[PDB]
Design an enzyme around this catalytic site. Structure first.
Site, mmCIF file in Angstrom:
data_model
loop_
_atom_site.group_PDB
_atom_site.id
_atom_site.type_symbol
_atom_site.label_atom_id
_atom_site.label_comp_id
_atom_site.label_asym_id
_atom_site.label_seq_id
_atom_site.Cartn_x
_atom_site.Cartn_y
_atom_site.Cartn_z
ATOM 1 N N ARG A 177 29.707 20.303 -9.797
ATOM 2 C CA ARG A 177 30.026 20.646 -8.417
ATOM 3 C C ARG A 177 28.842 21.141 -7.615
ATOM 4 N NH1 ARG A 177 34.631 21.809 -6.854
ATOM 5 N NH2 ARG A 177 33.875 23.744 -5.891
ATOM 6 N N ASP A 182 0.851 -1.188 0.000
ATOM 7 C CA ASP A 182 0.000 0.000 0.000
ATOM 8 C C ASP A 182 0.888 1.239 0.000
ATOM 9 O OD1 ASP A 182 -1.758 2.079 0.337
ATOM 10 O OD2 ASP A 182 -2.405 1.513 2.351
ATOM 11 N N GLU A 195 33.225 17.025 -13.850
ATOM 12 C CA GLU A 195 32.776 17.051 -12.431
ATOM 13 C C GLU A 195 31.774 18.187 -12.196
ATOM 14 O OE1 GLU A 195 35.947 17.822 -9.651
ATOM 15 O OE2 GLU A 195 34.587 18.858 -8.270
ATOM 16 N N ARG A 199 38.073 26.430 -9.282
ATOM 17 C CA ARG A 199 37.166 25.879 -8.288
ATOM 18 C C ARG A 199 35.906 26.717 -8.110
ATOM 19 N NH1 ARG A 199 42.215 25.268 -6.086
ATOM 20 N NH2 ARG A 199 43.331 27.208 -5.608
ATOM 21 N N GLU A 216 30.917 12.171 -4.508
ATOM 22 C CA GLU A 216 31.803 12.476 -3.385
ATOM 23 C C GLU A 216 30.982 13.107 -2.272
ATOM 24 O OE1 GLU A 216 34.894 14.938 -5.133
ATOM 25 O OE2 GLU A 216 36.054 13.122 -5.554
ATOM 26 N N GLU A 268 29.562 14.425 1.239
ATOM 27 C CA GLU A 268 30.100 14.963 2.478
ATOM 28 C C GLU A 268 29.012 14.962 3.542
ATOM 29 O OE1 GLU A 268 31.308 18.761 1.053
ATOM 30 O OE2 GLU A 268 33.328 18.085 0.520
ATOM 31 N N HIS A 289 30.112 16.386 -5.063
ATOM 32 C CA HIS A 289 30.717 16.549 -6.405
ATOM 33 C C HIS A 289 30.434 15.254 -7.172
ATOM 34 C CE1 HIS A 289 32.269 20.177 -5.122
ATOM 35 N NE2 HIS A 289 33.580 20.002 -5.272
ATOM 36 N N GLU A 300 37.001 16.335 6.397
ATOM 37 C CA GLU A 300 36.838 17.474 5.510
ATOM 38 C C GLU A 300 37.287 18.752 6.220
ATOM 39 O OE1 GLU A 300 35.789 19.378 2.812
ATOM 40 O OE2 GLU A 300 36.762 17.694 1.793
ATOM 41 N N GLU A 360 34.130 13.041 4.359
ATOM 42 C CA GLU A 360 33.811 12.785 2.961
ATOM 43 C C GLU A 360 34.244 11.380 2.577
ATOM 44 O OE1 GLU A 360 34.819 15.561 -0.026
ATOM 45 O OE2 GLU A 360 35.116 14.040 -1.576
#
Lengths: 443, 443, 444
Positions: free
Chosen positions: C336, C57, C334, C317, C133, C135, C246, C190, C197
């Site tokens: 981010r 259900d 990647e 970055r 990745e 965290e 990431h 981290e 992480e």
């Protein structure tokens, strides 16, 4: 299962204590415990009690008023459910007889046996029920040690750590399975600390023994973990209440009489007669299947409240729902009962109401697929959708005027239940509740 | 009393603040306060408001739903009852009018005025009421500072030190007497912390203004002593509840129409018509005179409970009692109301029910001198002694089907009261009460 | 993995309880447990459930609105409970949600990814790999105030014990996942206190989603065994780093690393550029899925290393996309923006569809932005045509409502339900009175 097997089980395991269990009119389990004397004489004194029963004073058993007897049903002999490892002790569920030797008329267990024995003799019919009792796990409020709060903050089907009772649910299920009391799924329910254990679609008497065993075992398991298990229907305002949806069907001559390949919704006429009988007597049924003042705090208008006397294929706002399973699995599901009811009496009144519909070939109303709670009061009046009673007293008066259910429960049970529950209501309506103090002390 | 006297009172006492007071549909008093500007202009701005009223937003006043007006009734201008020494501030009770300039149909005060003005115009009749409101004085529980207990352990008519409120009763009475709101006796009542203040048999409107003034003043007096005054009808189970016995009579052409020297019990036909009208409509009257859920905790079967619809000369188990006073003092006493009711509305419904009996010359049943509570249910059925509703909802449905009381209250009041009080009941019946938790958490 | 293998595992281990596990629209794991019956009958009663499914259900499952539904297990996920590996008597299996008619429920997030992954395979012979990745913060009760939670340690980036007070927790979560096939790589403390992480294997996107779902539950149960609490809240504490996810990703057409061209600039193929242009073109609408919380956007605020600027680069970055230097079979991009509060099944679904929407339409990608996007003025950003992601949840939802690409990828049911649920979620926040307001305005 037979007398010999029981004795050989005693001789092999050195069973030193035996428990004879029964239930009162309100479903509270009761038991008396006697020792097993060692040696030849002792094993014969045990044979005399297992076959002819033992005496006991039932003057203090609610609904039992004198000298009475308990008669073991040896098909229920097993190791203590809450103490499976302890082999020195055993128990057996009993029926209640009188001094003479006849089934006592007020026995809830004997009551269900009679109606199923009459249905088996007169129509070669079987009666199967598969309940879904819900319950709450409770711990003390850290700020108010005199109150209880839900045991966790988990939701519906939730995983750990939010679900703090996966092991508790795993243990109650193991304990019942290892003893023959079969169950199916279990999960964390919607409300916090709420859970559900789904029982096997099975013989309604075996299932009533199941439920009684389950309620006691979950409580002792909870206590081991420093918690409390409650089957109160609505312990907390603002969150879901605890119900016991009952899936049921009847079989005639080993045939699933609810299934008809060439009928509307593949439901047989007998099924519709049975459904019509459940709807016809619903207002009185709930006095038995919802027997507390708090029951009707769960039975209040809501998006998914089973208060509207109607049936549907998939609609959940109806009091009866028909699963999609067909063939051997065809069944109907009465959604109103809550787990505070006495299972023996509940199962009795649902069969009698359904059969009464069969005996009189009652026509069933159209399934209401629309949502009953959303439609206005005019559309309900037009469609003729009535509601179940709003309080325990209103339901007790419906039961008092129901001859179908009186003949099903019998005079003694019928009259005692009404008397005990009328006093229960008088106590409530005369009490000064907190809600009033909150509301009116300032005026 | 007239505009000039008021102004000269203002000029002599340098009244700097004025309070205009009215009441909502549920009897809660409301007021708005404005300053009195100094100098010529200010005294004329005050004259414009005293004669033509002032505007206010009554959209947040329960039962008042827009721009509205309050119209001072200058016969009520006096020094603040709870601040008699403070001469800089004054108050006056007001009627509620609309923007146009007509009496607003939902005004409880205007409602009582209309029915008495129609009774005065059409039959040259007067309507006098003398109430006996009871109340409880409360202090905190030393062990649970979040709860309240009775203020003392005194009994009925008790003396100090057991009676811990002789000065409080002396002050509330002085405060009302010194302002014209006449009262008679006062005493410690049966229950602990319970008291009673007996009001003067007087004009029912002046008496309704009396009651509203009294409820506010006793509360402020209590707070000065570190206590709380409650007019809750049944604040504690196990001890007497608080009622408001209402002594009433009507006069036609300056004559005590209830007295007939040459009639049975020296009661006139008009009196019996009036009594019959009260008994005929009792089941609906109590929705107004007993308008809370807790009211019906006091209205429960008991040795002295006013639940049985009948009248008697001395019997106290009846809903009406006739004192032995004759001549100018001939009156009847309706024993059901509790002090939580809105006096204006209560006084309206008792007159309309009594007059309806007079307008139709209704025959009255024989007085029941026997004790109604002790006689079995058969003797009651034989004598035809019915009971008042058992709960607030049952009473609201009786009122909903009473055209006599609808025409008496008017559509707006009639429909708003039922709506507000139906919601009030829905909240109760959906709440999880402590009584249930105590009773069902262990199952 | 095969029906037989599962049954043999049950008999030899005497498994008495099996768990049917799935996920709701918001990525919350859900499961139901049924007892395994004894005897050959129970083994056959079992077998029927594994091949054909079990009725459940789903009326009270968020996003699952008839109530009768089916759980059809993907037997490739069978194993012991990852958080109770020693209890052999219990096992679990991840499932797909089906209808009574034996068809995948259009509101199943797991089934949503499968559909797009199967379509990409049939029409282009393409695989889709994702390496996340995630965290998270480890929490402990504040000694001074019991109600409040504070970071579990005062360590920093890559720190050692004693300052790093969770090398054994990180080791256990990795051992638990690796021991059951859910492959992972590095793990480290981290930047923020109590922040950690766990780096995941660059693997099949669906398999990766299963590992993420299991990782989240397992780390929470491990934490509680240490008297701690683990949270995936994107920004639980002001004044320190938020937790992000990431997502390294890439597609392979016909078994070739399509993102790789030896002769093209930066050793990046046209297909890679089209894919990046697709992620960037739909960036504002994607973050509603990958960042589906009000708190997410307290992490997506302008900052030195805030992935809010819709651009790509090979090393910067401050961009929302970064291309690691690894070439060949390891060529990947990647993304981010995402954070661990997202539903990984839905997250990977919209990222694929946005990239393949760029590949399909051959979208020209912009020039890479190596300069620090945050360091440059607002005019320099307007000159370079660098736009930012939505500033709050409601702004992202509106972007999602107006994105046909992500509607087709998510499908109608999920699409509308997610927008209806999250609009209510935002409506609850905007009508509340926050402590920030009380602190700022109670004095006035």
């Amino acid at each position: 299962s037979t007398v010999e097997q029981v004795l050989e089980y005693v001789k092999s395991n050195n069973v030193k204590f035996m428990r004879f269990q029964f239930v009162d009119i309100l479903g509270v389990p009761k038991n008396v415990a006697f020792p097993i004397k060692a040696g030849e004489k002792g094993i014969e004194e045990l044979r005399d009690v297992l076959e002819n029963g033992l005496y006991f004073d039932g003057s203090s058993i609610e609904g039992f008023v004198s000298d009475m007897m308990l008669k073991p049903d040896l098909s229920t002999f097993s190791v203590l459910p809450w103490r499976p490892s302890e082999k020195s002790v055993a128990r057996v569920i009993c029926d209640v007889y009188t001094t003479k030797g006849k089934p006592f008329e007020g026995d809830p267990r004997g009551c269900l046996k009679r109606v199923m024995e009459e249905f088996k003799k007169e129509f070669n019919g079987e009666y199967f029920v598969g309940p879904e009792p819900e319950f709450f796990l409770l711990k003390k409020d850290p700020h108010n040690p005199h109150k209880y709060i839900p045991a966790d903050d988990g939701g519906y089907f939730d995983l750990e750590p939010m679900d703090e009772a996966p092991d508790i649910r795993r243990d109650i299920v193991f304990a019942l399975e290892n003893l023959g009391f079969h169950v199916e799924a279990s999960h964390h329910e919607v409300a916090p600390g709420q859970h559900e254990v789904d029982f096997k679609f099975d013989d309604a008497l075996k299932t009533a023994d199941s439920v009684i065993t389950f309620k006691t075992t979950i409580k002792t398991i909870a206590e081991q973990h420093g918690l409390k298990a409650t089957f109160m229907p609505k312990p907390f305002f603002g969150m879901n209440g605890s119900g016991m949806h009952c899936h049921q069907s009847i079989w005639l001559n080993g045939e699933p009489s609810f299934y008809d390949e060439n009928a509307p919704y593949q439901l047989s006429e007998t099924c519709m007669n049975y459904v019509a009988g459940i709807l016809k007597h619903a207002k009185a049924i709930v006095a038995i299947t919802n027997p507390t003042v708090n029951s009707y705090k769960r039975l209040v208008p809501g998006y998914e409240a089973p208060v509207n006397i109607a049936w549907a294929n998939s609609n959940r706002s109806a009091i009866i729902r028909v699963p999609a399973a067909r063939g051997k699995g065809t069944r109907i599901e009465f959604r109103a009962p809550d787990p505070s009811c006495n299972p023996y009496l509940a199962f009795t009144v649902m069969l009698a109401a359904g059969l009464d519909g069969v005996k009189n070939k009652l026509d069933a109303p159209e399934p209401v697929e629309r949502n009953i709670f959303a439609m206005s009061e005019a559309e309900k009046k037009e469609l003729g959708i009535e509601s179940v009673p709003a309080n325990l007293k209103a339901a007790l008066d419906e039961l008092e005027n129901n001859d179908v259910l009186k003949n099903a429960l019998g005079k003694h049970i019928f009259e005692s239940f009404l008397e005990i529950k009328n006093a229960e209501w008088d106590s409530f309506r005369t009490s000064v509740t907190d809600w009033e103090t909150t509301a009116y002390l300032k005026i």
